[PDB]
Amino acid sequence: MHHHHHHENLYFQGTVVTTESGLKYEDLTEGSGAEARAGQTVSVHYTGWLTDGQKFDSSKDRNDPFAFVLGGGMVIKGWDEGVQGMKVGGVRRLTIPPQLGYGARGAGGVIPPNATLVFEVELLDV
Ligand SMILES: O=C(NCc1cccnc1)[C@H](Cc1ccc(F)cc1)NC(=O)[C@@H]1CCCCN1S(=O)(=O)Cc1ccc(F)cc1
């Protein structure tokens, strides 16, 4: 029988994980609550930037939070992969390569073709 070892949970400080897809992430704060898993409707706060510091979007007050079905293709691939394994209360920084973001199409004329994206995401509910 396989057992989980919780390495990334125990030694998260200053740790940048690079996955087989090429996505990179770092837990800035480890969450205390439940774990995000595929199939769940999750709610989050977020800020997105280009590598050079230009902000392109944020979960501003309004009536947010932002919510989506994990693993269901409602968002960019780096988010469907990156949010899985976060715990409620956690803040996670995602560095997303263009293939896991908007690729060569870009978005709205604000995010250019072939852009790497940086996001800081806070998990509120699962
Ligand atoms: O595109 C989406 N899904 C389609 C899809 C599915 C599979 C693969 N590829 C695409 C969603 C839905 C959305 C579209 C447009 C919006 F304006 C707002 C939401 N978005 C996102 O996935 C990311 C990540 C989660 C927070 C929102 N953003 S985001 O901040 O980058 C958007 C943005 C981009 C450029 C801007 F100038 C401003 C906002």
Residue numbers in the entry: -12 to 113
Sentences copied from the publication:
Macrophage infectivity potentiator (MIP) proteins are key microbial virulence factors that facilitate host cell infection, intracellular pathogen replication, and dissemination. They are found in a variety of pathogens of both bacterial and eukaryotic origin, including Burkholderia pseudomallei, the causative agent of melioidosis, Legionella pneumophila, leading to Legionnaires’ disease, and the protozoan parasites Trypanosoma cruzi and Leishmania subspecies. All MIP proteins share a peptidyl-prolyl-cis–trans-isomerase (PPIase) domain resembling the FK506 binding protein domains of human FKBPs. All MIP and FKBP proteins share a general domain topology in their core PPIase domain with an amphipathic five-stranded β-sheet wrapping around a short α-helix, thereby forming a hydrophobic active site32. Inhibition of secreted MIP proteins diminishes macrophage invasion and leads to the reduction of overall pathogen load and virulence, as shown for L. pneumophila and B. pseudomallei, respectively.
Here, we determined the crystal structures of B. pseudomallei MIP (BpMIP), which contains only the core PPIase domain and T. cruzi MIP (TcMIP), which features the PPIase domain and a free-standing α-helix (“stalk”), in complex with fluorinated pipecolic acid inhibitors. In all cases, we found that the inhibitor molecules bound within the expected FKBP-like domain cleft that forms the MIP active site. In the PPIase assay, clear inhibitory activity of both NJS224 and NJS227 was observed against every MIP. These compounds were originally developed to inhibit BpMIP and thus showed strong activity against this protein with Ki values of 21 ± 2 and 90 ± 10 nM, respectively. Comparing the crystal structures of TcMIP and BpMIP with NJS227, the inhibitor adopts a highly similar binding stance and the respective protein side chains align well (RMSD = 0.58 Å). The fluorobenzyl group attached to the sulfoxyl group, i.e., the group present in either inhibitor, is nestled into a hydrophobic pocket formed by F43 in β-strand 3a and V97/I98 in the loop between β4 and β5 in BpMIP and the corresponding residues F73 and M125/I126 in TcMIP. This leads to near perfectly superimposable fluorobenzyl moieties across all crystallized inhibitor complexes. In the crystal structure of BpMIP in complex with NJS227, the sulfoxyl moiety oxygens are 3.5 and 3.3 Å apart from the oxygen atoms of the side chains of D434 in β3a and Y88 in the β4/β5 loop. In the crystal structures, the inhibitor’s piperidine ring rests within a hydrophobic cage formed by conserved aromatic residues (Y33/Y63, F53/F85, and W66/W94 in BpMIP and TcMIP, respectively). In BpMIP and TcMIP, hydrophobic residues in this region (V62/I63 in BpMIP and V90/I91 in TcMIP) interact with the inhibitor pyridine group.
